[PDB]
């Protein structure tokens, strides 16, 4: 829920918040 | 999920482009190693866009499906259009 | 759960997450709003 | 590839205005000349005021605003004064300023008109234009009301503030019979003929001249009095020539380093 | 001390701290703070 | 029969047998009204005028003018009982200052009636003794060159609110697009629409208990706890500034301690309400109803018109300034007249404020003839053709158009610009009152943007 | 009943004159039954249109 | 109410008003309460007694 | 309050013409002839006098604060 | 916020009056940036340059009317410099104005003494 | 960090710029992380401090302590090292969200780039007025400064004005060309517009994308003259292909001879990025679907279409400095014979209404099925008077010369419509309340000036005069009655602005 995360000050699952980013430790070698 | 049976679209969304550039810019600002020869560039957000177009950004996007499954897409694996 | 500063995100990244853990490897989730990456170990 | 060779006829000359004609010049030069008449001919005007007493119905900066607009005779010494920005003194000195003084009190039972005649200055060259006709009303004082102040006049030009504009109108015209068709009249027969028109009574325009260019420019330069109207022009020509020769010096120094 | 001017008979009178405000010679109660002696410069613009 | 209070009524001329009872002798007697004793009361007493209320009007036949009483080829009404005095008396105060209001779309007359209330002027003549909290007075108000006869009774001549300005209706450099306006900077340097703003501060001594009181005095760091980086050395020993002191934000104008129940006093001194540099104009001291010492300080600041400032014309054409050009850069006529204001023509056609165009024309005739023009509505003696014919006699194009030359290059402009003197108003709203430095509908839009990190950064 | 006895507006002289001649409508019981905002025919010569 | 028949400004002339520092053009028709000028806006109502 | 020193449009001094203008009207000139006699030909200067309101005369009725 | 009026025509510390940039788009072209000048000097220098047949392009603009500078763009034929064209046009204007000045002085005397 | 002030126009800003007061820019700060890439720049801003606007308000250390640079701290704490955050003042090129209430769609909040300007208002380019529903009669707008690289990058990539050019609401561009530039565009693109060498070179100074090559003029001899279409083709980007009709394009012309080679130049053709023919107007540069602005976005994208908007404005506003535009009393006046035709139309129309009344009064009028006799009568009278309004209005539009400045703004579509011309010149027409003719507010009559049972046009609010002729007193009051209804309706619908949006969301 969008409002529910907003009431807690968390990232809304809308738009730019609908996914997660992980560091690729393998691409960091170069 | 594995590299096969990826059902999400191979294009990077605009929302992923926005957050990848935003996140990589802050990393470059925090002295993260830069994956391209910067030709005197200094703005970390223009370096991130330079790294994006080179497909050099060391980030993976975890896309969540509405069943709770997820796909991990390397940023270089997605078709980047801007 | 180790936090690693972006300055370490070079080739020695995985070695550093060990060397730091041995002073104080999962998927490193990037925290939104911060450079630090969180590794469970 | 070279300079125009213009000519002047002066058709009217008074202490108030010159009418003159320039022929065989560009419109660009003709327009930049009238621009200098308005904005870049220096005159002297009051710029600094200190009020020691004011009991009038006008607030201090209402009076100070009116003082700045009073035209001061500038002809001889404005070329002699430095700009205060160039002068070596702290604050003001005779090199850069003309001191003025005013002291009036109304003690009679009848309204006293304070005027530019009551402004008095440290040097006789530089006085209100009307003090050499009625004087400019500064303020009216009731019995017991009082005004005394010290002021300095300074060199400047209308590009800084309109109080340093010497002109009181600059009439400018070209091609009075619209042979160039730089304007197009929806009904040419409804338009009054110029002062400078050469047409007969019935023809409303010159026939279109495809080869014509602007080449005869009519001026009426009216002075506000700080300068004689013909020295406004000569100061403008000298000033515009100085502006161009200042460029050529700084332009040369760059080319002296580009190579 | 402080000099104030009566708003009615226009006379000056001297007044002091904590002193109530009454005009001598006419009793009127409104006073005005004269005018300062410190210099201020105006641009005549 | 109603003798009740609160009935609205109006005076009307009595008509009998298709003739007014008002005869030439009544006008003759009323002409000598300064020394003959005759007055309006004698017009009522003679039975020549009558008051009629809103439901006695259910029973009258009103002639709109004595023209209606004349014999006519087909007779509409032969039984008129009353006649209008002048039809323009249907307007009120703020609508009576509109010239040619019968030539305007009615919503724009309504907007002027609200905008007139916001036009600076001289609000009252004794403004020097008034310590009003906020007041605005114009340096150089003018009466309108083009005026309505009702404006006499409004005393608009005596306390005018605006200036007659030379207005070009031109698309110049584009800074007047939409409703913006270009103003001549050189006119502004000469005091065009210059005004001063007066702000008055009250402060009061108090006695709150057996051993706590507020008194005017000059605070000092060696005794007062509440002291700040504010500046106290402008105060005199009475704890007040004197008039003629130059003041700025966080200057203390009234020093007032309260004795506290290193330190021994709290500070409750009053500051200049905004950072706007002003000058103290008057300081009056008195006693209040309770006999405690009471102060009012008035501060003045001069407000030169800026690009943000709002102006209007009496025809509902409000607009901010957009830029100011010096006289050298303004467009100019052959005679060297630059306009004071350039408004955009795009303000005109959909608003249909044609009264604004007629005012500029009548004002040009008026400034040349040297005679203030009668713009009373419903006047069959003033028509646009007649104004044009009069303008032609002064050697101007009969429709008010003029050949302008570009100030930047001196070339003629291909179109001939409409120029005339128009009565403009400076409105209370100024950008220096407003420059300052995210609700439900803003979050809703940031969700539709998907700017989820923004939407949480802004909250 | 509220909003009577307003501070006199001193912005400009015409403002003062119009404030001294202003009328207010009943917003309550009768107003919600009426059509009070329309310019009624009977305002002619009584109230400014 | 200022300039009502019970006001001290009633019947005064332009000279007298200026002596009192009053504006001759000020219309009156308002009150002064605690130093604030107050206007009674007229209140429209339905007429009584008529059916 | 008081007659402007310059004309706003063109800068022509009009601040010395107001008393002469009132004198000419006392001499039963029309406003037009009085403006012509004063040498105010451009309509931008004519309106500087024709529309002036000399409110300073009303401000001078009030006695000063300080005698 | 309000700029001082001298900010329109006085160069602040370290400003150059002129700066010349070669236009990379096209051969034999330059941009001249003139600080603290307006249409008064822009329009005459352009118009004089348009009299030089070895000048292919001349134009000027004030980039923004609230800031006080000009850009003049000049393109010349090969083997003629746009800097040379700029200098030559200024020498022509100084010639024209010194001629016009002398002829106005003469016409004053002939009007005053007759 | 946010700010609010009045907005004013600035036609020399790009559509993606906002002009920001220097005092506001000094009050707003952005925390920039110190790095070896920027430490020299950030140290200068610290040395300038809060004293000179290109400076900084705080240094925030790794400890989280902030060295406040307002109150002049000791030079030994002006040291910077990597990982400190300097709260520099807002500078040229910062990204801000810019907003106007009420927020009604996502184009009410767009990304703009800061340009610091003298004076105290916010400056926006005039194309961006239309999304915001803004103008410059007093409007204020809010500036929101994003505070982090992440949310800075969000706005850059998702919300900037050029990305907003086309709305998913209706698959159309939200920004057109507007006002002076649109009236100038139409005039500039007539066949008649020939430009001399000096004029062309001036206009090319403003074209920011121009490649530096002057096109060969459409006429070489006897005199080199370029056409307006020939310079506008240099503005059109890429190789766009488009066909449109100008607003005055006649209906028959596509079917008779001269389907191509349009006589009035009323058929727009763009090929290979070159305007071949046709007068441009709102139909080609406005917000409607398939406009040349729309196709530019589809073919070339946002970044190039941003430049297209900017180049149209800057060069054509500088051409209007030569041609000019105005409106005056002359445009509102018809010829004597036009007035005689308008008057003779009204004279008959009134007599026709009298004949309807004479049948109704004599009971010679038979009702239409499904309508009452009163509805039958009122329908017939409204037909007569609305026909007269339209017959007089077309007669006025026929009178207008090609020079007429009302027609120039209507035919461009920039402002006004044919009914505004008609009401100014010919007839204001029938005044209505609640969709009906003016009610009998007095007993059996509309005003005391009329006799009872007067159903004629004058009695019931037909304004037979134009705004130039001015209204009679009864017409003035009945026109105030009709105008009050429109004021009430505006007050009602401005109470509902976000109501359904708020409930749906
Ligand atoms: Zn006393
Ligand atoms: Zn003038």
Author numbering:
A (entry chain A): 1453 to 1482
B (entry chain F): 46 to 127
C (entry chain G): 10 to 33, 54 to 70
D (entry chain C): 2 to 133, 145 to 271
E (entry chain L): 14 to 58
F (entry chain B): 614 to 874, 886 to 1061, 1086 to 1107
G (entry chain B): 463 to 511
H (entry chain B): 155 to 205
In the authors' words:
RNA polymerase II (Pol II) is the 12-subunit eukaryotic enzyme that generates messenger RNA and is thus a focal point for the regulation of transcription. Here we present cryogenic-electron microscopy structures of Pol II bound to Alu RNA, which reveal that Alu RNA mimics how DNA and RNA bind to Pol II during transcription elongation. Biochemical analysis revealed that Alu RNA binds directly to two molecules Pol II via independent interactions with the two halves of Alu RNA, Alu-left arm (Alu-LA, also known as scAlu) and Alu-right arm (Alu-RA)2.
Although both Alu-LA and Alu-RA bind to Pol II with high affinity, only Alu-RA is able to inhibit transcription in the presence of the heterodimeric general transcription factor TFIIF, comprising the proteins RAP74 and RAP30. The resolution of the RNA precluded building of an atomic model, but did reveal helical structure and the binding location of Alu RNA. Both Alu-LA and Alu-RA bind in the Pol II DNA-binding cleft, adopting a conformation similar to that of DNA and RNA within the Pol II EC. Comparison to the Pol II EC revealed helical Alu RNA density overlapping the positions of the DNA–RNA hybrid, specific to transcribing complexes, and downstream DNA. Additional density partially overlapped the positions of upstream DNA and exiting RNA within the Pol II EC. Altogether, despite Alu RNAs adopting an EC-like conformation, the Pol II enzyme was observed in an inactive state, consistent with an enzyme–nucleic acid complex not competent for elongation.
